[PDB]
Every structure is written in structure tokens, then in C-alpha cells.
Enzyme design. Sequence first.
Site, PDB file in Angstrom:
ATOM      1  N   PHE A  43      41.332  14.003  19.500  1.00  0.00           N
ATOM      2  CA  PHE A  43      40.629  13.153  20.446  1.00  0.00           C
ATOM      3  C   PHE A  43      41.300  13.282  21.801  1.00  0.00           C
ATOM      4  O   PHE A  43      40.636  13.479  22.816  1.00  0.00           O
ATOM      5  CB  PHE A  43      40.682  11.687  20.022  1.00  0.00           C
ATOM      6  CG  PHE A  43      40.052  10.755  21.019  1.00  0.00           C
ATOM      7  CD1 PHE A  43      38.685  10.500  20.986  1.00  0.00           C
ATOM      8  CD2 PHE A  43      40.816  10.178  22.025  1.00  0.00           C
ATOM      9  CE1 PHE A  43      38.088   9.688  21.940  1.00  0.00           C
ATOM     10  CE2 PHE A  43      40.228   9.362  22.988  1.00  0.00           C
ATOM     11  CZ  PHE A  43      38.861   9.116  22.946  1.00  0.00           C
ATOM     12  N   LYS A  45      36.486   3.378   8.216  1.00  0.00           N
ATOM     13  CA  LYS A  45      37.298   3.063   7.052  1.00  0.00           C
ATOM     14  C   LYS A  45      37.924   1.669   7.177  1.00  0.00           C
ATOM     15  O   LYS A  45      38.469   1.135   6.212  1.00  0.00           O
ATOM     16  CB  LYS A  45      38.366   4.143   6.858  1.00  0.00           C
ATOM     17  CG  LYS A  45      37.772   5.448   6.310  1.00  0.00           C
ATOM     18  CD  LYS A  45      38.783   6.568   6.216  1.00  0.00           C
ATOM     19  CE  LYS A  45      38.185   7.776   5.495  1.00  0.00           C
ATOM     20  NZ  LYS A  45      36.830   8.143   6.017  1.00  0.00           N
TER      21      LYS A  45
END
Lengths: 329, 327, 327, 329, 329, 327
Positions: free
Chosen positions: F16, F127
Site C-alpha cells: 500500500f 477480517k
Amino acid sequence: QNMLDNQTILITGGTGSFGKCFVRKVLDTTNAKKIIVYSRDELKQSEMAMEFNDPRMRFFIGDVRDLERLNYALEGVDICIHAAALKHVPIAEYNPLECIKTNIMGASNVINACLKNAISQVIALSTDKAANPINLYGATKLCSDKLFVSANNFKGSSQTQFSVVRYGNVVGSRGSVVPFFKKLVQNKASEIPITDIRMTRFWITLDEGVSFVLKSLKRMHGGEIFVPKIPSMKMTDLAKALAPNTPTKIIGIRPGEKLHEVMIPKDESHLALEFEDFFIIQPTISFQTPKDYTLTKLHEKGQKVAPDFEYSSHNNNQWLEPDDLLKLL
Amino acid sequence: MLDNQTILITGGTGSFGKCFVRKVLDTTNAKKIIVYSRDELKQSEMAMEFNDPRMRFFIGDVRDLERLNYALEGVDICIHAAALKHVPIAEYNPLECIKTNIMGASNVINACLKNAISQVIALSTDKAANPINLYGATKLCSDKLFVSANNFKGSSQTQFSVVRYGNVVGSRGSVVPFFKKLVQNKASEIPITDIRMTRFWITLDEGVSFVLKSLKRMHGGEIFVPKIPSMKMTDLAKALAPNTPTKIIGIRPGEKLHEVMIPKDESHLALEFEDFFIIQPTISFQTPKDYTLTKLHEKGQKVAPDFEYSSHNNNQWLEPDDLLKLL
Amino acid sequence: MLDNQTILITGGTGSFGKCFVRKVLDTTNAKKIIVYSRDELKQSEMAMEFNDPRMRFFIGDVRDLERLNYALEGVDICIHAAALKHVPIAEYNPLECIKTNIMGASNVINACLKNAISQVIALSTDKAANPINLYGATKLCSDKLFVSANNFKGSSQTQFSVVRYGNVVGSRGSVVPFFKKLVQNKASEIPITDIRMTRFWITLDEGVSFVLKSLKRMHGGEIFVPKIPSMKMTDLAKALAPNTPTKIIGIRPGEKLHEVMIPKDESHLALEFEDFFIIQPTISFQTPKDYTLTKLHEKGQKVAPDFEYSSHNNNQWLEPDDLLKLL
Amino acid sequence: QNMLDNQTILITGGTGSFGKCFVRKVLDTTNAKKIIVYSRDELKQSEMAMEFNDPRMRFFIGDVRDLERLNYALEGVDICIHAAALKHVPIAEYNPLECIKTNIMGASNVINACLKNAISQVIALSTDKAANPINLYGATKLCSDKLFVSANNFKGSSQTQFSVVRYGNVVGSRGSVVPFFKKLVQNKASEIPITDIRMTRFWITLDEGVSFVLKSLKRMHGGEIFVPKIPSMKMTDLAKALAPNTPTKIIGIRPGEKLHEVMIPKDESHLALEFEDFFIIQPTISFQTPKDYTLTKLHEKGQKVAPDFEYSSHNNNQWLEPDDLLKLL
Amino acid sequence: QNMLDNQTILITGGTGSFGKCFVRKVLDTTNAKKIIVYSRDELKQSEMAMEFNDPRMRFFIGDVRDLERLNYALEGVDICIHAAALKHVPIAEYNPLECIKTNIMGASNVINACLKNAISQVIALSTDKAANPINLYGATKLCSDKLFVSANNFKGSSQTQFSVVRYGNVVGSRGSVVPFFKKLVQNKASEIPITDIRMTRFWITLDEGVSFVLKSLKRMHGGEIFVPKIPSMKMTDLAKALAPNTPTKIIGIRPGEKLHEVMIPKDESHLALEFEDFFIIQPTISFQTPKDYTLTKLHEKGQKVAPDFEYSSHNNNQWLEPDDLLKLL
Amino acid sequence: MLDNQTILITGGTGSFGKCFVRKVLDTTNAKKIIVYSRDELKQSEMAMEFNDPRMRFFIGDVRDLERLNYALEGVDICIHAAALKHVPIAEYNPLECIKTNIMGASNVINACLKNAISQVIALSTDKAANPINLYGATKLCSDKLFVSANNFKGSSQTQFSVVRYGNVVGSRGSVVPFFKKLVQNKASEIPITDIRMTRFWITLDEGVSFVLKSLKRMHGGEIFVPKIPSMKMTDLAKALAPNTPTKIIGIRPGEKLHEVMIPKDESHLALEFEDFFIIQPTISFQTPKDYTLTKLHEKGQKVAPDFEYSSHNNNQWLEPDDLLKLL
Ligand SMILES: NC(=O)c1ccc[n+]([C@@H]2O[C@H](COP(=O)([O-])OP(=O)(O)OC[C@H]3O[C@@H](n4cnc5c(N)ncnc54)[C@H](OP(=O)(O)O)[C@@H]3O)[C@@H](O)[C@H]2O)c1
Ligand SMILES: O=c1ccn([C@@H]2O[C@H](COP(=O)(O)OP(=O)(O)O)[C@@H](O)[C@H]2O)c(=O)[nH]1
């Protein structure tokens, strides 16, 4: 000769006035295997190492505020004498947290490290300023005394003993007045600083204090606050016998100073046991396995005191005349 | 004045705490009152009890400096009442008492200076004067830290003072409540320690009032002591439950017979006022102060060379009947 | 200029410390001089020695960041002289030396930035150049931290520089004093290590002077090195006690034969001046600087490609007689 | 075969260049019972676990700056190899405190945890940059070396041995120049970065370094700084044999870089003992129970060096020609 | 009678609702040698000491966030029950870091201290709010559960066992709704706070929870998450049977509240083993020395559940009618 | 807008991170972009890769509060992407995951408030919704801390928001790359877990775009969720390597069959927009906010009483061919 033979001893604040005298005494009169000096200053340690230059000596640079350092230093130690402290009353009033870190947290750390390394006996030095204290220094020592006494409740694979030794002013201590009065008259004195007339302070010699600590080691069960019977001296006679050729101005009373020092608080008499040359203040709390403080390890018997007793410096019968004082270099 | 100011109280869920919060809500225009304490149960119950938008609750420990740094943001006045005060439990858990009362004081001071609080008042106890028990010793250390904290002179000026008083009539865990729990139930024995035993007595509301008054006249550095009555324990028995047997159990751990409020060794530091005393700092601040004149222009006079404010030689006592007029 | 500024000196009770404090009191208008060190004995004696209202003493350890944060409030200039410098004791207590000298440097830097100090000068040593002993290694780490600290650019700008010089004539624990302690007493043997042994020599007063001068011309980031004479130890003996036998004990733990002030590997970073050198930073600050021109408009020239400022090839030495003119 | 059989080994920085080679060697040539990799990055650990996929492997995520994590990880370990470090010189100059926390405090923590868990042998990796250092990285390694050597003074219920292995540049290290020069010429190079003509650096292969560490384990008494005899190569021939078809510009000298690296300081010769294929720098300090570093555990004899000796990269007799270099993939 | 005789037990959060009931049960039904209550509040401890006044009791003031305090307290302990926690969901949403320090770091500290003192068995209390959690409290408990389960991998001179016990709402818990509903109607209620119709919650009595923990001690191998089969009750019938004479307003849903609580996540069925009166969720990870969770220490057999099973409060067959509820004081 | 602003990215050397840095350099006028991470190798390689004077690299750990305090000086925007995200490694090293993800979040928040950062966006994961694995639980704790951090109201206002999305197509360590490593090499078996397995899929560039867009419309307190497609794993196989055998290994440690983005139990907190969702805070800030209208004046509508944004019942999926149009 006795209990100190073949033992490894560590003394925090070993470079101090009590420390050097204690180390000297242990080296001279015992077959101790090793003596460890634990303190911060490299200057005092380097010079003390040259002064004693005894192969039985070991010098550890370290702070009692540093738990990890203490854990490492106390490894293999059998007896620990805790003399490290910040004791200057006025400096302690202006730097309260520093006095607290060293005296209180220092006590807690030493206790923790002594338990971790299974030390056998531990004696912490206290002061009469810790009885019914009015200054910060005295309060920190009272907290310290309480921590050491309470540490006896613990019970690991080895039950370490913790006791306290409490006494007053040391004749001509490293920073005392005696060594101060001699420096003045020496540097041509013309005026001596005095506080109050009716002032009073217990007095004991450095050597007697050291001998008292060592004797306490032989008689302790753990949990006792040992107090030696010592004479009292009014500050009046103190200045006259140490400088009768110069005047004295009643300077202002230092911050946090008492007129008379207490040795055994009236409210704690019920815990006090008198002996021939000393007193024992029993724990205010009760442990798992009690102890019979009435009989020391030296089979010495002690009797409870008067429910109104109070060991103060002004209600004492022992008084040292201006003579013997001068007999103290 | 708390006029639209923000106040935070450590140990705010306790006896002193709840009484103080009620008084501030009802008698001042504080815009926000923050409760800082550890227990979620007491805070949840207190929130429901004090369902007022001016309230704010922060779960936190005074042993946690980072947490205090955060909670004291935007606070003008801090009342420090967090403490471990059970004498015998403190004797058995000395380091715990030291961590909360001593390190707690150091952290509060640090967080107040950092957040530029204006005034701070820490609660002390008569057990801190010429102390013999551990609890009392930690409180004396706490008092010294707060008095000494006045030497700081950073950006915003922060004043620190201490309020010292005795037993709070029927306090949380006190004896009076303990007896009211015995009288209202099938009892037959009244636990007693000594006979000459004496204590100072102040009510929860008088304590709260004194703290509020202390804030208005403090310069920072004082240990405020209120003039309160003494009462022999042989009267608190002939009041909370007369015509009943009392067994002499005896002295308790770390307990005195008489409590001291102003030590004879500190008289020279004491200044007397109409209804209270001020024990001046033992140290000299770079920026001196005249405690002879409060912020309320009240004048105080030095006290006698051998003054001793004790619960045994007090020139005023409580009546066994006026004693019940509190309960 | 220290004109009505506040200065704080870590390790202020030491040799450098007392000399520096005396100079500042006598030659500047500093409004306040703060001594920060651990020992209550030395501070009490120093307070009596320097009974001056401009002095302020803080008991504190440079290993204690919180304490430094507090003590540096309102300070304009910080002189960092706190250290553990006994080479052999540092070899036997390495972590202690690391905690004081390295972590101590990190804490001082942190507290100075937080309190927006204007200038900071840390004392280094020639033992920090191409070091072989632990003490020297920690000082090199300290030097690097202080030089690197200049990259910060928060609210108030803080400049950090280092002053590096050799053995201080008759320093606290030095040899000269050790010999004066042997000469004035029934002696017969003069402990000696080598024969080719050489060292740089600067007086306590010259050190203090150089630090003061460094403050006036620093931009932040420099390691200032004064041009000082070298002296073979075979002369310091034929001066402090001639006509006396000297036994060759030999080399000591972590000791060199010759000390280096400016490493050959860093010459390219060195700039020469009339009476001193500047070793430029190895790194590039977001905000560059020209060390060729001091704040005092003094011009410096680069040095020869293989320059080596060592105590063996120094172009100036002390006379066995001018040596005694210091004692 | 030897001392490593049935032993549990933990290597800090095990995912690094030295780490993977060392682990591979131990698994291939010994009957070690377990090998623990201790490092921070989950990426390198997950991939290393797939690369080795050996049931004798154990991977612990952890930082050497974290004492409590180390205490837990070293439980049950017999041998600890300390290779974790921040080694990029210029990055260490710009981030001095980070290098100090990892290299110095990391060393102190590993030592503490090894003692607590009674590890038998410990070897920390050093660098020639730590001899008469000029850069921050080198100073931190010198501090580390000093800590490990000094750790031998300690004496608990089990006397852990701590030694150091010091060598120079690794041919084509994870971030070295060799792997850099090959990436340039590969990505169509047209200019190679050079620093100085007379430049010099010791060179040793990754496999030789690993073999040297393992051999040091067999001969160590504890307290030694092992230095292997290795050839020197001028940077001139290095670039020509790895890219003779492209030019080179004399770029600026990196921050904190030396021209020649030192292996054994002239001022420490008196402590140095020469052997057939290596040197031993003895402790500057003296321990409780001395050791005869003259004879290794492999009964190898060593002789003191010249009081003026100095192992530098420019006064070496061994020099690797541009040929064998290319023989190193 | 069994495994608890002559054992020393320490329970964190012992002054709480579960704590007092657990202590009472252990004192009444076992020959435990000593029971240590570890918690922060001096008020609750002083009153609990008066309530039980049993010489087998020991009270330690302390925080589970304080590792050093825990290390000292767990000395000599054989079994540790971890019940200390911040459980108020909305307060946990407003004070997330506090809940994290107590619940997560507290778990880590207890584990560390239990290992250091070689405790034999450890059970941590969990909650159904920790299964597929949506609120902060539940997430911290899930982290705690994971820490305890993972602690079984460790292997020192003594292999400490760590298991978890997970169950739902306790009928009339110290701060539950039952004790809240009774206080309202008592103080003249005229409206009861309700959240949602289809609401659902598992219910178990304090005594059953305590009995379940003790039974889990007898059957645990270490690493299990014990879940008891308990009935479900819609909030509708709850308010009617506890206050049918007053109305109820559908107040807003509390911050972070679910409609139905999960006991065994559908995604974890493959790890679940069903028994007569309870379930066992096996570790997601594999240890050094595996365990056969199919057979408890009480020789009880368990069978895997349906690969699509999910123990929710709304898909349960057991439902307690408004009658037995009132039978719970 | 980042117009001449300073931005810092924790975990900036990661997947990222590098993508974000490239986008900021190319599409904004940020004056400085700071990378904060631990590894000197990746930072040295990234520096050479991004040889741009607007870049600044700080070696540091998010577990180190003091270091973050220093690195965040002068920063306007902080993107928090540092994390331990390997699910099975987190199951075996739970405390490590907790220290980095949870304590890391607490330290970042603390340092941002202290340095008066304007906006902070922390990266979350699907998650973290109704989590079953440790990694997911720590991220949920992190999300809660960041949302709650908005209650602070010190000197400068600091806004904290969270961005939550699923699997990043071919991420660092992902599966796609794992398969491209098997297809390009002599393979024969394609590791598979289940068959009904499904996951959300977003590209690295779309993630970076969404974060940038989130900054422009955030008020502070939101958990931004982008509307992204779902893809059954039985298609990612018939795309990255068709005509090849895939063995059904089975479910992995702490792994779900379907990932959730917006829990049914939180629907009532969700607000829908044209291409994204906003999950409102569960708590009430002293200073309320209307999330129905973004800073970009975009309007959002509440969602259905039983809405469930899962990767199994998604109203949009990726094509086995458009899937390869990313690789
Ligand atoms: N001495 C030399 O020959 C020489 C040569 C070259 C350079 N230098 C430089 O000059 C500087 C000072 O040298 P000096 O000769 O004045 O040394 P010094 O006489 O030993 O004084 C150092 C002082 O630092 C204080 N200190 C030690 N540890 C401390 C700690 N942990 N926290 C706070 N204070 C601490 C000590 O006072 P307390 O015990 O009250 O803490 C001590 O008085 C050194 O840093 C060195 O870099 C000295
Ligand atoms: O871009 C570069 C980097 C390094 N070097 C040289 O290659 C040698 C090794 O550099 P490296 O970064 O591989 O290792 P270091 O010696 O800094 O550990 C040094 O002598 C440098 O002078 C070079 O010529 N060009």
C-alpha cells in the site's frame, strides 16, 4: 569466627560514611569471602578501591533505582546491607521526588532483587527522623522501613530475612556539623551557626553504628527494627566544646527540622521490647509463621516496655559531656 | 469561582467525590465536571445517579501518567481525592499504597503542569502529621510533592494546595456506618479499641465546603486545616447505641490514640484564622508569597511557640446528641 | 551572549562544571545558572561555595527523561557535561557507561527540544576519535546523536554542537593531581605506562573559555576542536617530580599510546581556523549550513587531503617549566 | 559429529543474509535438535519458512529491543548466535538512536536473556568497522562487542560463554555492491558509482563467514574476539571484473565511510594472538577465572603478534584477483 | 475429594460476582490449602474479608496490568483462575484503551507470571461476546482467549496448562438487568427499558458457571475453550416475569450491542467437539505435543459437530420459561 | 487537499505504502512525504526507487511512542498502514500482533494529537468485522481506538477515520502472486482450501484512490467501506491457470469461508452512498457530527433493517477475464 565467614556481602551506598567503615570492619574482623560495593559515583569508587585495594573487594557501578542492575549485582549474595540514600533534609524538601525515588523505590527494588537471588539476610539502615516524621526525608525512610518489615511475609524456596537498624546522628558524619564546626574554626572562625537552645539529638559513633549492625545480623529473626541505647547531647555544649573561642548566631531553623528527635514513638511502645543495650520494635502486622522476638538468636531476653514509654532525645538519661566529644576525631 | 470552568476529580466515585460533584452542580456554574477513577461499576451507577450533561466519566488510574495527561486536557481545576486509605490493608500492601498515593501524586502534578491547570487541591489526612502508619507516611510524601510543585514556573502558572482534616462522620467504611449496621441488626457487642481514644470529626458536607473555600483563597503551597471538634470514642458509643455492652478489643495495627492536625514541630509555620489554619511551606519558592493574607483578604496571625493542635487537647467537642444529628 | 539568559549545566558539580559556573557568574549577565546532577553532598557543598542567588540546584539523573523535562523548563542554553569518564571502570561497567553517556545524551536532546532550548553544547573527548575503549565509543555515539539532533525543525529552533578536547591539566582524578599527592608525601616511585606516550593538554580554564566561544559562533552541528599543545609523558615526570625514579608499569586497559583529535578519515570534513578546527557533519540537514563562516564572521579553510591531528605529530608542545606554571 | 548435536540453537536476525546461510549450514551439516529464527518481519519469516520447510525449524516474531520477548524465546536454548542489527552506515548516520537501540540495547537484552535461561555458548557478530570506528554503526558494534566480552565476568549456577566474531565485507551481501553492480549492468548500465582509487576492503564469502562462526564455537573459551585471515581487494579491480564494458564516475564518498578498514587496531596488538588461519583479540579486562587463550578448545596454539602489528586492509599480503571474484555468484 | 485438595489457588478479580461465588464454592466443597483474591479495590476486599473471615483466605491488592505485582502474587500458586476484567460494553466503547490494558495486557501479564511461577493449571473466563464480536469488549476477550490458548505452546521445566471457559449472561449479574429490573419495580417502577423484540441471550446461573469452571479443571488438557450447553430466553418474557405490572418503552439500542449472541461461530465448527452437557472448541493452531481433546480427563467422549453447526442464542432448543426465572433470587 | 502539506505514512515501505507514495507525488502538491517503518533494507531500496527531494525516510517502530512523537513533528496528514497481517503467523505470535496493531494504534493516535495533526486515516480490513482470527481482532481493537480518538478536543482539532476493504489483488504475499510464481514455473498442483470460498477484491490502485477520496470528505469518526466486487475462488483458478489440476487442501488456520465488510448487527449504523458506505461511530462525541452529508456534500441514505454486506451475497462479481486484466 561467626556467621559472616565464607559469606558474600553486598552493601548499597558502600562508598558513603557508614559504607567505608562497615566494609573496613568486615574485612578486618571477619572471614567474609567477598564484599560488593554498590553505588553510582565512579570517583568515590575509584578512590575507595585505591584506599582498600583488597582482593576481596568488588565494585559495581549502579543505582538502587535500577531494578535490573540490582538483580544482576545481587547474584550470589548471601547478605545485603542497604545504606544507599539521599539524607540531606533541606535538599530533600526541595527535591522531594528524587528522595522518594532513591529511598522508597530504592528500598522496593533491593527487596525485589534480594528475593530473586535468594539472599539470606538483609538489613536496611533507618533513622530516628523516621519516627513520627515531619520532613520528607523522614517520611521516605518510614515507608522504606515498612517495606522491609513487610517483605518478611513472602515465602519462596528460600525465606529471606529482612530487618531494620534505626539510630540517630553520627558524630561528625560525612556532612554532619562536627566536621563543619572544625572546618570553620580551622579557616579562622568568628561566628558559629546555631538553631535553638533546648535543641537535642541522639549521638552515636560511626564505629558503634557499624558494630551495632553486625551484632543485629547475629541476633535477628527478620522483621525487627533494632534501636540502640545511646546518649543525648544538647547543641549548646556541642558548639562550646568544639569552638569556645568564637561566638554563635542563632541562625534560622532549617526547613523540616525538629527540636528533639524521636527513637521509639509513644504509640508504638506496645510493640517495643527492651534489652540490656538495645530495643526491638516488633512488626505492627502479623506474618504467616510468627517469631518470638523476646529471645534473640544470641539467646538474649527482652522485656516489654511501659505502655506509655517513648524514647526521645530529651527524656534520655545518658548525656555525653563536652569531653568525650573532643575524644572523637 | 468555577464560573463556566472545567473541573476534574480523581477518585470522583468515592464518598468525598460524590458529595463534591453534587455541590458543584448545585452551587456553581462549572461547565463540565470530570470524574476520573478505575471502577466501571461505580461510574455506571454514578452516571445514572448524576444523569446530567455537565458530567463526564473517564475510566483511568492515577498510576497511569499517559492516561492522566489525556484526561486533564482542557481542565481548569483538579481536585485530587484518589487514594488507598485503609490503614491495615496499607500495612499489608505497602507498595500498593505507595504506588497509588505517592506515584499517583507525582503523576497528577505532572499532568496538571503539562495541561496548564490553574488550581489543584489534594486531599490529605491528620494521619499524615507525625505519622506512624504506612498510609500516613505516603500521604505526608504526597503533601510534600504538592507543596513543592509550586516551584515550577512554566508557561501557565499552576497553584497546588493541600486540604487536611480528620475522620469523616460516617464515611465509606467508617465506624459510625459500621455501628448503624450493628444497631439495626441483631447485635450484642460493640467493638472498641481503647478508652482514652479521641478523634477529630468533620462531616462530608463540611469537608466539601472547606475545599471549595480553600480554592477561593489559595495562593498555592498551603496546607489548609479546618478548625473542627474532637470526640472521645467513649461518647460515640453512648450515642450510636447506648444501653449496650462494648468489649475492649484493643489498639489496631498502625493506629494512634490521638490524631494530630498541626505538629508542635511545625507551629512556627502555622498561621491562625477565624475558623482555620494555614501551615506554610518549609521551602522558599523563587517567587515568594504572603500567606498572612488570603485571596479573600482574610488576615492570619502566627501561633504560640508551642502550639499543638491535637484531638486530645482540643478546645471544643461534639455532644453525644448533636452527634446523632448527623448520622 | 548570555545576557539575562538561563543556563543549565548537567554534571555541574564536576571539575568542568564548577569552573564554568564561576566564569559565567563573573563574566556574563546570565540571570540564572542551574546545576543538574545526582549527588546531594557535592551540591550542598557547591551551594555554600557559590552562595549566589543566581544559582539553582536540581538533584537529578541524565538517565531520567521526566526529570530533565522538568529541570529544562525556561532554559535558553544547556551545557551537557554529565558523564562516566573513568576508562577502566567503564570497561568493567559497560552498560552503566552506555546508560549515562548514550541514553543520557538522548534524554538531554529530547528535553531540550521539548523546552525549546536555543543552544546546546555537549562535551566530547579525543578518546571518541577512532576509539578503542568503551568510554570512547559511548562518547562517539553521544557526539553523533547531538550532531544529528540538528535535523529537527519544530516550533523553536534548537542548535546542538559538540566541543572536543583532550586531557585537562590536573583534572578531577587526573594524573598531575595524583603526582602532587605523591610528591607532597613520602614517595619513591612514579607509576608510568609507556615511554613514547603522548597526550594533548588543555587547562580547565581554557576548556571553559573555548565552550563559551563555541556558543557565540555555532550554527549547530559542529564538533569544535581547539588547537592545543601535546606533551610526552617523559616530560610531565621531569617536571612534577624530577630527580625521582619512575617504574615502567606499562599500558593500561583500553588505553592508547597517542590520542587523536581529528581522524585522517574525516579530514575532508575538517575546516581550519586560526586557533581551532570544525569537523562538519557527515549528514545533510534539510536546512543546510555553511560552516566556512562562523557566527563571528571568522573564515575557515579546508585542510590537506591527508591531515591527521594527533598527539604525536603535533606542531607544538608544552615546556617542562611552563607545565608547572599551571599545576 | 560434534558439539552441535542434539542442541537447540537460536539466531537473532535469522532471516538475514548471514542468517539463512547459517541456518542452512546447521541443518545440512549437524544433528542440531532445533533451530530458532528470531526476527521482526513476518514477510521474510513466512517466505523463509516455505524455503526451508524443515520441521527442525521454529520461527519467533520478535525484536531484540524487547527484553521480555527475548526471555521467552531463549527458553530451552543451548546456543545463541546474535546476528540481528542495523548495518547500513549512511542510514545509521541519519537515524543514530535507532541503530543504538537495535545494536547496543539489543546486545544488552540478548545477554540478559541468555544468562536468565542459562544458555551455554553465545557468539555475536561484529564488523571491522568496529575497530577504531569513525561512523555511528561502527561505534554501536564496538559497544556491543564490549558488552559481550564483559558478560563473561558474570557467574551464575551456569557459566554462559560469550565470544565475538569479527570480519569484513561479505562478497555480494544482501545490500552489498556486488549485487548492486550486477543489477546495473543487467538493467543496461552506462555508468558505475565509484568512491576513491586507493580504496580497500577485506573480502570473505558468506559461506566462509558461516563456517568461521561454527568453528569458533568449537574452539571458544568465552571472551574472545575471533578474526579470520582474509584477502584484500582494491575497489578498482572490483568494478572492472564486474562491469568492464561501462564507465565509472567518482561519486561522492558516503557519509561516515573510511578508505581502509581496520581488523586489529595497532593499540590492541598486545592483546592479539596469531594462529594459522585466524587471530584472537583477548579481553582488555581480567575476569574472575582467567582463560588460556593461547590454546583453543581444538588444541590449536597461537603466538603473540608484533607490538606494532596492525591488521589493515592496505597492509595485507592476500589479494583476490578479478578472476575468483567472478567465481562468486 | 479431588484435584483441588492441598492446592493453592489464586483468582484475579476475586471480589467480583463470579469471584465471590467461586471462592465460596472452593472453601465449602474442597480441601484447598489456600485461596488468594487478587484485585484492586481496598473497599471490596475489606468487606469480602469480613464476609468470609476464613483463615484459608489471603487478599492481595493488585492490578492485572502490573506484571511485577502478579509475579510476586502468583508465587507458590498451583491453580490460577483469571476473572479480572472490564466488561461494561458501553463504557468499553468510550474507554477503549482502558478495556484493552485490563483485558488484553492483563491476560498477557497473568500468563507471564503463571509461567514464571510454574503454575499447574490456568483457566481464563471468556464470554459469548467474544465470538464474531462487534464491540470492543468482545474483541479484547477474543484477543485474551487467543493468548491463553497459544500459551500452551511454551514448554519450561514445568508445562503449565491454560484453558478458557466461555459462557453467556449471568442471571442477575452484579450489574445485569435482572438486579436492575428488581430495583425499579421496588423503587416504584412505571416504565421498563427494552431494546428489541426478537432479542435473545443465553442464560446461566452464577452457581452453574462456577461449577462449570471447577469441572473444566478436572477434565482439561490445556488449550480448550469450554462452552456449556445453556438455554436461551427472549427479552420479552424476561421483563414480563420480573415486572408485569408496569409498561416498557423500546429505548435505544446500547452502543455495540448485538441482537443475538454467538457461542460457537459457524466458521469454527470444524474445531468443535460436542459432549453430553458441553462443547469444546479446539485450538486453531497446532502445538509441539498434541492432545486428544476427544477424551477429557474424566474419560468423557466427544464427537465432532456438523460442518455447518453454529451455537447461537436464537437457534437453541433450550428455553427457560418466566417461572424458573423468578426462582432465581 | 494535500496542497503543500506534509504527509507521513507508517508502514510506508509496504505494498500500500509504495503505491500511495507514488500517487501522492504524481497527483498532489504535497511538500513532503515521510516514510516511517523499521527496515533499513526496504527504505534504502525505496529511496533509490523514489529519488525525489520531497521524500523523507525515518527508521522507526510504531511500538515506539517517543520515536513517533519525534517523526510526526510538522505533519498535517498521517496515513497509518503499519501492521502485522499474516493470519497464521499472528495466531502463533499473538502478543507480537497485539503490540504492533493495537499498541501501535494507540501510539500513533497519541503522537498525532501531540503534534496537532489535522487528519489521520488508519487502514482496516474485512477480517476485522465479526472476526474469528487474532489478526482480525487486533484490527477491530485498532478501529475502535481510532474512532474513539475523535472525542479529544485539545488545542488543534485532529480527525481520525478508518478505511476498510478486502483482499488486495496480487498483494505482497497474496495468492495471485503465489500462483503467478507457480504458473511461470514447472508446476502441476494448485493449492486450494474450500470450494464455496469467496472474497472481496480491490486493486492496490483502487485502495490508494479510496483513501485519498476518504480524506477529502471525512469529518472524523467514520469507517469508510468501498463498494467492491466479490469473486469465488473457483474462478481465480480458472483464470490464473486453467487446464490445470487443483488439490483441495482445505480450510486454513483462523480462516473464514466468506468475509464480511458490514455486519448485520451494525447495519443500523451504516449509511449508503453511490459507491461506498459509512459505518457511523457507536459512541456519541461531545461535539456531534452528521455523517449523512460528507465534506463533499454527498448524501447518504440509511440501509435496510437487515442489511448484510458479505462476499457471498454481493450484487456484483469479477469476470475470470477481467480478473487477468489486473495481474
Ligand atoms: N576530565 C577530563 O580530563 C576530560 C577530558 C576531555 C573531555 N572531558 C569532558 O568534560 C566533561 C566533564 O568532565 P569533568 O572532568 O568535569 O568530569 P567530572 O569532574 O567527573 O564531573 C562529571 C559530573 O557528572 C555528574 N554525573 C555523573 N553521572 C551523572 C548522571 N548519570 N546524571 C547526572 N549527572 C551525572 C557527576 O556529578 P554527580 O555525581 O553529583 O551526579 C560528576 O560531577 C566530560 O563529559 C568529558 O566529555 C573531560
Ligand atoms: O554506490 C556505491 C556504494 C559503495 N561503493 C564502494 O563499495 C565498497 C563497499 O560498499 P558497500 O555499500 O557494499 O559496503 P559497506 O563497506 O558500506 O559495508 C565501499 O568501499 C564503497 O566505496 C561504491 O563504489 N559505489
